[PDB]
């Protein structure tokens, strides 16, 4: 037996020394040196620094530029907004609490902070999904005589919201629960504690299956299809060097999209699983931090990949940033 238990938490440390205190109550400097709390903060800062500009600028530019306000772009705005919840709901909170060494805002604090940090990152995920689906529809033209309009874009977005609530809301009302995770400065879903009174075991799977594998598959299908369609059209049109580039560059991106997606959600799935399947096993509060380190940084690199690397968007930034000109 590895950790410490309390009504609304689980501390990854052995209170045999009698030093363990509630993370809602006192600094966990036994869990980790203070300077390591400092580095945690350093990070949270970083992600705020890069993440808030990049993502906010995305909304901003979409305002200065009429050419951005198209249906195929809605989901991308969803994506930035999501990231912003991830910043203000997660990153900044955790910067504050990390600096105390414990989750100062109590359990309600843990529920909110957990809920928005979680809501935010799921919208983002399902954005990335919905996105690939639209791109597949529009390009692989799977349904004949079908044109993608504003009214689809709207559902697209709504659907990410529903999907996301379908995961962030349960823990708030009994199926799984939110608890300071890691070094106990932030509050995640419970997926490592087998807490029968809330059925963590089940939710964990439902999470794993609906909120990981589905996405994973869909995304892989839709993009495969597309790197198919475009690789084919290229062959059938060798005479064109442009169509040659397109197909080449479209591949390069879909590889990225995918690689980058595993980097984000693999760690949580990898851990959730290994934990589920090694239930008699002790997991460090730093190591418990690893999966969440990856999942949070995507609030920086998803904007970069899906927005700054998007040809349309990029221009208007360079334009906006360099003062109306260029």
């Amino acid at each position: 037996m590895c950790g410490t238990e309390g009504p609304n938490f689980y501390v990854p440390f052995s209170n045999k020394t009698g030093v363990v205190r509630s993370p809602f109550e006192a600094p966990q400097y036994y869990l980790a040196e203070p300077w390591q709390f400092s580095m945690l903060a350093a990070y949270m800062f970083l992600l705020i620094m890069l993440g808030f500009p990049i993502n906010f600028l995305t909304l901003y530019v979409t305002v200065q530029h009429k050419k951005l306000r198209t249906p195929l772009n809605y989901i991308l705005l969803n994506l930035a907004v999501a990231d912003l919840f991830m910043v203000f709901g997660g990153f900044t909170t955790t910067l504050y609490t990390s600096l105390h060494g414990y989750f100062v805002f109590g359990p309600t604090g843990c529920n909110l902070e957990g809920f928005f940090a979680t809501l935010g990152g799921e919208i983002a995920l399902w954005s990335l999904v919905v996105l690939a689906i639209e791109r597949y529809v529009v390009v692989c033209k799977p349904m004949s005589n079908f044109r993608f309009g504003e009214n689809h874009a709207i559902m697209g977005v709504a659907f990410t919201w529903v999907m996301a609530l379908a995961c962030a809301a349960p823990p708030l009302v009994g199926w799984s629960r939110y608890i300071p995770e890691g070094m106990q400065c932030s509050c995640g879903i419970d997926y490592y504690t087998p807490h029968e009174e809330t059925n963590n075991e089940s939710f964990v799977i439902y999470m794993f299956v609906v909120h990981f594998i589905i996405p994973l598959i869909v995304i892989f299908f839709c993009y495969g299809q597309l790197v198919f369609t475009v690789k084919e059209a290229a062959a059938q049109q060798q005479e064109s060097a442009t169509t040659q580039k397109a197909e080449k560059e479209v591949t390069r991106m879909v590889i990225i999209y995918v690689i980058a997606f595993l980097i984000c959600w693999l760690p949580y799935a990898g851990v959730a699983f290994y934990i589920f399947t090694h239930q008699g096993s002790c997991f460090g509060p730093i190591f418990m931090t690893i999966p969440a380190f990856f999942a949070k940084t995507s609030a920086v690199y998803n904007p970069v990949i899906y927005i700054m690397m998007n040809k349309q968007f990029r221009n208007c930034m360079v334009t906006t940033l360099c003062c109306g000109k260029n």
Partner: peptide, 11 residues
């Protein structure tokens, strides 16, 4: 396809 590719920002 290059038209739709553009609308998606993929090329």
């Amino acid at each position: 396809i290059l038209e739709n590719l553009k609308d998606c920002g993929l090329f």
